PDB file of C-alpha atoms and ligand atoms in Angstrom:
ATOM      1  CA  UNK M   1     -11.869  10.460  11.971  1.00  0.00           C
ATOM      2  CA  UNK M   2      -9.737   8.097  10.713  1.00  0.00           C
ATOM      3  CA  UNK M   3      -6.842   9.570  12.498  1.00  0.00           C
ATOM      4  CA  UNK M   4      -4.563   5.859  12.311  1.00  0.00           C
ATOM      5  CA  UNK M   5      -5.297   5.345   8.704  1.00  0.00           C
ATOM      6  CA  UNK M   6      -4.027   8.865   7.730  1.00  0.00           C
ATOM      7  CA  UNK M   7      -0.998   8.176   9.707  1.00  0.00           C
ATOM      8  CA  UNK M   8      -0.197   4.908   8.162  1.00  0.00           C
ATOM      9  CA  UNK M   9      -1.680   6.441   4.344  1.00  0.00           C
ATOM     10  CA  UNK M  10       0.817   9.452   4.678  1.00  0.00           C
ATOM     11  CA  UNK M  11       3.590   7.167   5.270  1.00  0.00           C
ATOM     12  CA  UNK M  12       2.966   4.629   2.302  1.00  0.00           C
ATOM     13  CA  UNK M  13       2.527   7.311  -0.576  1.00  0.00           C
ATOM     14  CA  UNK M  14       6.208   9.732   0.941  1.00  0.00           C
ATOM     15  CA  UNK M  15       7.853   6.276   0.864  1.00  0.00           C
ATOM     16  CA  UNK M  16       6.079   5.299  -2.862  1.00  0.00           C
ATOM     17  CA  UNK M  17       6.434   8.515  -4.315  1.00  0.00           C
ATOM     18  CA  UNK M  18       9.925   8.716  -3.240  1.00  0.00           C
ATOM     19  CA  UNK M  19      10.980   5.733  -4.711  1.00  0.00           C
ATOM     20  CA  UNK M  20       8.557   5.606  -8.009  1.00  0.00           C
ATOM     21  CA  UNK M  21       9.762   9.140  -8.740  1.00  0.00           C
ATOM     22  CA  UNK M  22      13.552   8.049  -8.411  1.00  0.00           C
ATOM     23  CA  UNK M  23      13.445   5.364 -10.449  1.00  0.00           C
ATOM     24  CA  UNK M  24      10.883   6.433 -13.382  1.00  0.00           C
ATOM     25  CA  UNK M  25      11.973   9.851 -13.848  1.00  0.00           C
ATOM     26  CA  UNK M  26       7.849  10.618 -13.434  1.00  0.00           C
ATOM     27  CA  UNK M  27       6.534  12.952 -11.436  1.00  0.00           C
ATOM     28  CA  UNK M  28       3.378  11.987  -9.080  1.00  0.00           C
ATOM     29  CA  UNK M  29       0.111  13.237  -9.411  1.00  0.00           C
ATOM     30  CA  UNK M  30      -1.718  14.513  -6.672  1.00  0.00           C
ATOM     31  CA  UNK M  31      -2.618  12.455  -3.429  1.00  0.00           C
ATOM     32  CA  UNK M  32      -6.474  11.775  -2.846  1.00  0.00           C
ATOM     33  CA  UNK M  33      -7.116   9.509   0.237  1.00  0.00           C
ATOM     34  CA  UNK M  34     -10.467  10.041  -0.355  1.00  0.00           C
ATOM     35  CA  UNK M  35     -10.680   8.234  -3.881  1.00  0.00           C
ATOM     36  CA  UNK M  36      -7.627   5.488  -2.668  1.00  0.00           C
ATOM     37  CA  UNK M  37      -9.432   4.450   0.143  1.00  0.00           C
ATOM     38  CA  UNK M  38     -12.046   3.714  -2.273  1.00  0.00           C
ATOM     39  CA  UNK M  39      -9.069   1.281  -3.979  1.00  0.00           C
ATOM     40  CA  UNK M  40      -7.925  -0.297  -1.048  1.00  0.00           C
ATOM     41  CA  UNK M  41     -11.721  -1.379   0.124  1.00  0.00           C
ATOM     42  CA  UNK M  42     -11.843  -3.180  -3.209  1.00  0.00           C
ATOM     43  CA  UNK M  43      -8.131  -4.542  -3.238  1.00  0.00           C
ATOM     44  CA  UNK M  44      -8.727  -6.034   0.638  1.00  0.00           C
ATOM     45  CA  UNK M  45     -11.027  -8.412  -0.122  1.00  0.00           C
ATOM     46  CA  UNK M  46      -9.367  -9.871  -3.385  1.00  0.00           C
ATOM     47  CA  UNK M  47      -5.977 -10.451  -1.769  1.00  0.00           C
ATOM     48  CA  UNK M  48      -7.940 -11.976   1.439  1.00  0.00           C
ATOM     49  CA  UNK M  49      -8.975 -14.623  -1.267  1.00  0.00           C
ATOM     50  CA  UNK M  50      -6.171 -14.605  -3.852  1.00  0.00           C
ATOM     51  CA  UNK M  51      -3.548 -14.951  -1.068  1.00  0.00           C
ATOM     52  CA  UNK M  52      -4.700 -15.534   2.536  1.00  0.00           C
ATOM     53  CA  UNK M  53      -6.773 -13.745   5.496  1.00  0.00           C
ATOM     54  CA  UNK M  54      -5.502 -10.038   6.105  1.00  0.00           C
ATOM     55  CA  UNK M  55      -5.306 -10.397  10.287  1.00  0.00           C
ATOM     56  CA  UNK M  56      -2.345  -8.751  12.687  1.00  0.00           C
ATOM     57  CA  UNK M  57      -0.213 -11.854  12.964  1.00  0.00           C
ATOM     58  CA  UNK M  58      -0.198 -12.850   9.145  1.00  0.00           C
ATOM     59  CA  UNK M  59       2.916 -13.869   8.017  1.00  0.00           C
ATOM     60  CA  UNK M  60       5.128 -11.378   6.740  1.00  0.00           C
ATOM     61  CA  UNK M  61       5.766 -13.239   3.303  1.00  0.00           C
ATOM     62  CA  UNK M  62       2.187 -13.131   2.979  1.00  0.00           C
ATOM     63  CA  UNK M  63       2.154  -9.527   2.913  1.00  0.00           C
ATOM     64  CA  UNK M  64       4.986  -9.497   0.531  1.00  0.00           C
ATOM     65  CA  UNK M  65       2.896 -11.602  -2.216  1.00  0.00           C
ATOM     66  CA  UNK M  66       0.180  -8.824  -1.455  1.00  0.00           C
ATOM     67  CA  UNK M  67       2.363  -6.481  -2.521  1.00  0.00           C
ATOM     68  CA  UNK M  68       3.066  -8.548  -6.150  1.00  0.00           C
ATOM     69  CA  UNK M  69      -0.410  -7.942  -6.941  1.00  0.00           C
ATOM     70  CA  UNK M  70      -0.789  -3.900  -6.038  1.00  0.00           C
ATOM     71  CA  UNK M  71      -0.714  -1.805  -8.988  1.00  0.00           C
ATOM     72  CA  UNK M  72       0.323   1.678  -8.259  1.00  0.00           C
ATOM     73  CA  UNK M  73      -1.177   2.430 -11.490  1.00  0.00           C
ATOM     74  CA  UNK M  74      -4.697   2.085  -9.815  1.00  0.00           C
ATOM     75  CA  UNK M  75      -3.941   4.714  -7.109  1.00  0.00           C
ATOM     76  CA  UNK M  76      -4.667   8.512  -7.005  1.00  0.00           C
ATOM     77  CA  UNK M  77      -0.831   9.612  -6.636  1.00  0.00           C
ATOM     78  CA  UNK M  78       0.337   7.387  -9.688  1.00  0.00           C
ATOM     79  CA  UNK M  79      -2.743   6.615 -11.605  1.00  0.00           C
ATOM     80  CA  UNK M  80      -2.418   5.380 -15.096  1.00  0.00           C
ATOM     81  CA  UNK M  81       1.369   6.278 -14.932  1.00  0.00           C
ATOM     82  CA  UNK M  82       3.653   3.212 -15.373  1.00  0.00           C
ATOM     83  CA  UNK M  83       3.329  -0.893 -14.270  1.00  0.00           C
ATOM     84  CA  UNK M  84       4.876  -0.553 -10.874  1.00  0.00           C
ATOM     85  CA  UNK M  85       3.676  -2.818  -7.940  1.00  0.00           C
ATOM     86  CA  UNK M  86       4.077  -2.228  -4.476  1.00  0.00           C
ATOM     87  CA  UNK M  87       6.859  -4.607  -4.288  1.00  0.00           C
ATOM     88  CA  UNK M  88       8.890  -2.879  -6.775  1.00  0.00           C
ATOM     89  CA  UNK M  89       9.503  -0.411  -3.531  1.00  0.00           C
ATOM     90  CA  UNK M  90       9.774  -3.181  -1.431  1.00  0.00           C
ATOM     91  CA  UNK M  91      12.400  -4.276  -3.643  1.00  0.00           C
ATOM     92  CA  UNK M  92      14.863  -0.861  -3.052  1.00  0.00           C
ATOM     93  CA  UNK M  93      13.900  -0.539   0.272  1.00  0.00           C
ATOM     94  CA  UNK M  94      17.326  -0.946   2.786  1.00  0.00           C
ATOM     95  CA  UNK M  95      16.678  -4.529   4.976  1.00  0.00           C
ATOM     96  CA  UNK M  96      15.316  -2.244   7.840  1.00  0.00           C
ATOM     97  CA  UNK M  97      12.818  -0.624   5.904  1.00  0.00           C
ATOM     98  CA  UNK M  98      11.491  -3.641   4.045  1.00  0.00           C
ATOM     99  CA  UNK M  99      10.374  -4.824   7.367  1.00  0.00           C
ATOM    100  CA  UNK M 100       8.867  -1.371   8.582  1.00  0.00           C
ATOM    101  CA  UNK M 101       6.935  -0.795   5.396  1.00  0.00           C
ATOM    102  CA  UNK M 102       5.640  -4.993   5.475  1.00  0.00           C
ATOM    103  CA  UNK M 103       4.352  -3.703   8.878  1.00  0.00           C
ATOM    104  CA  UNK M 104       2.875  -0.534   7.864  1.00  0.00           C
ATOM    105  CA  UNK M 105       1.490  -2.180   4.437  1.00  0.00           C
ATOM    106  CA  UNK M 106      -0.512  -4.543   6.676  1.00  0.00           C
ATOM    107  CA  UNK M 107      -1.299  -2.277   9.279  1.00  0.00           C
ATOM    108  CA  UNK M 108      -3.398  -0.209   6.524  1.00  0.00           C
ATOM    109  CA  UNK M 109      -5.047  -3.072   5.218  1.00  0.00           C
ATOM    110  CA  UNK M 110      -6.265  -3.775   8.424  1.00  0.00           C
ATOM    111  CA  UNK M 111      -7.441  -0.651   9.296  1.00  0.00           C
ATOM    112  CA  UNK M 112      -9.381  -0.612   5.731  1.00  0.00           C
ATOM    113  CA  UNK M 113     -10.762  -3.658   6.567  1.00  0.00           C
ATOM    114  CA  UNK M 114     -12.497  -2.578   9.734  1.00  0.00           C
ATOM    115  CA  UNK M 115     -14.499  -0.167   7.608  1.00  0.00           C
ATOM    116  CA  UNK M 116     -16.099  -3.364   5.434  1.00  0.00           C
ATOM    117  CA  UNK M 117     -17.190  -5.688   7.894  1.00  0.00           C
ATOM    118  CA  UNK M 118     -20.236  -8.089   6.646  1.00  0.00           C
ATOM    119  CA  UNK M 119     -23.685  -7.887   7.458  1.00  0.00           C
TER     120      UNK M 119
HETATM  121 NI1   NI X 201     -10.836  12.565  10.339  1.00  0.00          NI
END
């Protein structure tokens, strides 16, 4: 179950880690979907309302602000460890993989957000 989400999961926290560990000198803790799935359910609804709707065709700056406001700090791999924000790995991403990881950003959002539909 939740054989996409993995996918996408496994590729945000190699590219994180990668780049959080290169640039702190830190080493990662261990990865727990489990307990950040938990962390994204909470975070999709806030940037929803803080920013704008989380659907496939949002715009791609959008996602970008999303990433302002996504504290690595709250997230098993990285938790309590330093400031960092998603976009800080935006940031030293090459211009081809800024837009990948935009896309694959999103593309886990929306897959956590299938899992908290309303009643
Ligand atoms: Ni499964």
């Amino acid at each position: 179950h939740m054989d996409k989400l993995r996918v996408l999961y496994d590729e945000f926290v190699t590219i994180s880690k990668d780049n959080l560990e290169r640039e702190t000198g830190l080493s990662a803790s261990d990865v727990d979907m489990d307990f950040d799935l938990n962390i994204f359910m909470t975070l999709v609804p806030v940037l929803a309302a803080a920013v704008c709707a989380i659907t496939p065709t949002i715009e791609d700056d959008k996602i970008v602000t999303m990433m302002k406001y996504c504290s690595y700090q709250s997230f098993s791999f990285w938790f309590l460890k330093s400031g960092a924000v998603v976009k800080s790995v935006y940031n030293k991403l090459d211009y081809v993989k800024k837009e990948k990881f935009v896309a694959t950003f999103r593309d886990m959002l929306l897959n956590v957000q299938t899992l908290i539909s309303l009643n």
